[PDB]
């Protein structure tokens, strides 16, 4: 029972860390989109 408890706690910790990493991966894009749209609007104004 003690071994089971310790293993379960370790697995819970590992799974929590993995879930945190996965959520971080799946949840910079905004900044790049903003930069692209700013470049595009500046290009439009200069061309215009």
């Amino acid at each position: 029972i003690v071994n089971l408890q310790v293993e379960m706690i370790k697995q819970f910790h590992m799974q929590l860390n993995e879930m945190h990493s996965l959520l971080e991966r799946y949840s910079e894009g905004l900044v790049a989109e903003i930069e692209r749209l700013r470049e595009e609007n500046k290009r439009l104004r200069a061309h215009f």
Partner: protein
């Protein structure tokens, strides 16, 4: 009776889109274009004003 469309000669085309070379960084075929200059870059207050090097292409 028209200024012939500068479709043929690259020099004539650039002259038309540059307005006889008046345009510096833009080219246009539209006569109703509102002429604008490129906006001031956001980093000018942070990085100063860099000399824009024309792209080699």
């Amino acid at each position: 009776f028209s200024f012939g469309d500068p479709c043929g000669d690259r020099f004539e085309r650039d002259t038309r889109v540059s307005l006889f070379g008046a345009l510096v960084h833009s080219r246009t075929y539209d006569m109703d274009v509102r002429l604008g200059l490129p906006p001031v870059p956001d980093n000018a207050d942070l990085s100063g004003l860099a000399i824009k090097v024309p792209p080699s292409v």
